[PDB]
Ligand binder design. Structure first.
Ligand SMILES: NC(=O)[C@H]1CCC(=O)N(Cc2cc(Cl)c3c[nH]nc3c2)C1
Ligand SMILES: [Zn+2]
Length: 140
C-alpha cells in the first residue's frame, strides 16, 4: 500500500484505488497502473522534476529503505496478475531490488522529491511507475 499526497491530489496504484478515488477521479491510465484523485486537505509531498537514475525506495515486505540505480521510463512487458491480464505497462522503471505485490505504493525518491511508486516486481527486480512527467500535479 501507499500513496503520494501533493497539493490537492492523491496518487495511487490504479489497482488499489478506493470508491472515494474513483468518485473524485482526476486522471487515470490503466497502461501506467496510475490513478489520481482529489483531496480536501493539502498534501506535503514534492514531485521530483529531473532525470535522476539513482534514489531510495521503501520496501514494506522488508520494513527497509533501499538505495537503488533504476532505468529510464519505458514500455515494458508485464506478466498476468489478479488485477490485469498479461500486457505492456508504459512509463516503467526497473531496479535490482526486493519486492512483493504488497509493496505496491512504496515511494521511490531522489534529492529533488518523489520520482514514482512501486508497481511491478519479481525475480530480484522491482518496477516503479514514474510520476515526474505529470507536470499538472504541481498546479491547480
Ligand atoms: N502493475 C502490475 O501489473 C501489478 C499489479 C499488481 C500485482 O500483483 N502484480 C504482480 C506482481 C507485483 C509485484 Cl510488485 C511483484 C513482486 N514479485 N512478484 C510480483 C508480482 C502486477
Ligand atoms: Zn532527481
Amino acid at each position: 500500500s501507499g500513496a503520494i499526497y501533493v497539493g490537492n491530489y492523491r496518487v495511487v496504484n490504479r489497482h488499489l484505488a478506493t470508491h472515494n478515488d474513483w468518485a473524485n477521479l482526476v486522471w487515470e491510465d490503466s497502461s501506467r497502473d496510475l490513478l489520481v484523485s482529489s483531496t480536501t486537505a493539502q498534501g506535503c509531498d514534492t514531485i521530483a522534476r529531473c532525470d535522476c537514475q539513482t534514489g531510495v525506495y521503501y520496501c514494506s515486505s522488508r520494513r527497509k529503505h533501499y538505495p537503488v540505480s533504476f532505468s529510464k521510463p519505458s514500455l515494458i512487458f508485464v506478466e498476468a496478475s489478479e488485477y490485469y491480464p498479461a500486457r505492456y505497462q508504459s512509463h516503467l522503471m526497473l531496479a535490482v531490488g526486493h519486492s512483493e505485490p504488497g509493496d505496491c505504493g512504496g515511494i521511490l525518491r531522489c534529492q529533488h522529491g518523489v520520482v514514482g511508486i512501486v508497481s511491478t516486481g519479481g525475480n530480484g527486480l522491482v518496477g516503479f511507475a514514474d510520476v515526474r512527467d505529470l507536470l499538472w500535479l504541481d498546479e491547480e
